[PDB]
């Protein structure tokens, strides 16, 4: 992690809890503008060693005011429905099991599907060689760019 993104996430965070308090769009707008006004009016530019101390201040000042429970959108890990639908998301390979009396009933979809599976089984060695190629001994980074096919 790095300092800039850090202070930023503190900002989005604090701002959100700040809505959670202010409820009304009005008051929230006002205090929001006041808040960003605080971040700039303070040290929008400074040496680092002071700045980290300013964060250590800010974290406390936030933690005291953080509100017993923020608003959370349902998709988010809090959620009123963080995984309501995980009952349903069946992995594709499972259909590949239906046996012909079922498989006959969707000739089209299955056709297109073997097209895909073919595409993969054909493709795979290339991702092998490429992954083998672009990689050093093996650093922090995940994935690597396409260059001529598949990726």
């Amino acid at each position: 992690l790095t300092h800039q993104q850090k202070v930023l996430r503190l900002y989005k965070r604090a701002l959100r809890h700040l809505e959670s308090w202010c409820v009304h769009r009005d008051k929230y707008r006002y205090f929001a503008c006041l808040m960003r006004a605080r971040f700039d009016e303070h040290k929008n530019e400074k040496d680092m060693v002071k700045a980290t101390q300013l964060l250590r201040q800010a974290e406390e000042e936030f933690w005291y005011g953080q509100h017993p429970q923020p608003y959370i959108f349902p998709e988010s890990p809090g959620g009123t429905s963080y995984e309501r639908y995980e009952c349903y998301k069946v992995p594709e390979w499972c259909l590949d099991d239906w046996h012909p009396s079922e498989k006959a009933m969707y000739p089209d979809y299955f056709a297109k599907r073997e097209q895909w599976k073919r595409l993969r089984r054909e493709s795979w060695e290339r991702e092998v060689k490429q992954l083998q190629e672009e990689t050093p001994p093996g650093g922090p980074r995940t994935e690597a760019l396409p260059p001529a096919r598949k990726e």
Partner: protein, 457 residues
Amino acid sequence: LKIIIPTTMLLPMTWMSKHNMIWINATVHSLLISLISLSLLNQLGENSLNFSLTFFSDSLSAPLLVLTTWLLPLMLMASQSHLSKETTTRKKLYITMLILLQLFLIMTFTATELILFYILFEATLVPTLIIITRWGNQTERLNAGLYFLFYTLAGSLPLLVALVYIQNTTGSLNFLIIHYWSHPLSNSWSNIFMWLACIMAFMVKMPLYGLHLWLPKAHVEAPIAGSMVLAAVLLKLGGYGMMRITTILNPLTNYMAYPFLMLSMWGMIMTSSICLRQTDLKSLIAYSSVSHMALVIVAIMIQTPWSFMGATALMIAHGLTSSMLFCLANTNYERVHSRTMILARGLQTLLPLMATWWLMASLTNLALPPSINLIGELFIITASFSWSNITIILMGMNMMITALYSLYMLITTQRGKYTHHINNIKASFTRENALMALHILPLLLLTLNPKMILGPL
């Protein structure tokens, strides 16, 4: 003697059966002989039923006998896909272990001489040993064999000498007359060692909390056909015998019950607590089994008639439900070879009907009305409560934890996300559903007519 001959007769039939048809032979005829076993159930409301000089059929034995006859086909249905690549002679050798085993059971339930009952009681030990040791998976099974073995013998052997002693200090060793000629033995010190000598073997074979260590380590290892018997039956037979020999003893039981009532009343809550945090399912079930057997053993020792009624009922119900959970776990173990419960994850998502069986099975494990499990348990809580008003505070905690872990095994190995890469699962065979439907249906019909399962008292 009529039910017992054909049970012998399947063996020639097995050996002479065509090499790829044997499963059908053994299955069909085992079912038939089950139905013949069922006619025994009639009993009588007064006198214990009698037969030859050498057999009799107390009401206490009959439901057990029916059960024991009933299990063979089940073990066959479970086994017959677990093994396939095995050579024909070896397979044909294999079912012989099972049937030979139940033959010893049909003999050892109807008794009648307690020395005959003993020698069969201990004779059961061999085939189950062979099965645990040759067809169990992974290394530990070897070691497991030993724990299963000596704990029985170290218990059984003194019982043996004790038996011989009595038929010398009194007339016959036979059960009926000893039920009638019974006379109290009392305090001293010789009589106390007589007491433990006539109890410890039975209290080993149904595990007691201080001694149960072999049992989980048997169930971890045994191929499922060994598991179903080792759980559903042998424990219960140890209980049957202990209910038998209590015709003697008294009044001394009043004075000697206490230590074992402490190991049991505490061991139930304890083992159930351990049960709440297993790494792998196949053990979880086993500790659930001990956690229920403790109830049987106090139910026997408080010796109140309610307690024996509840004893019988709970023995049978726990039989069926435990066997059911075992096969029902082996299915997962075959589909993914995980054994560890954590890997199964979202198994419900990928297939439904098994989730239904998980539901029914666990649901009757926790015992809710009017499962014969429950009603079996409530009586012994009643008599226990009569025996000591405090005792309820212990029983209640059991009924807490047996909820939790039971539901737990459900919600951890089912509800939740599928693991992604585990492609191995393949959509439920007919025999699977057939099998567990075969466990659970009798268990539910049986509630309609308890009066034939409560037993002699």
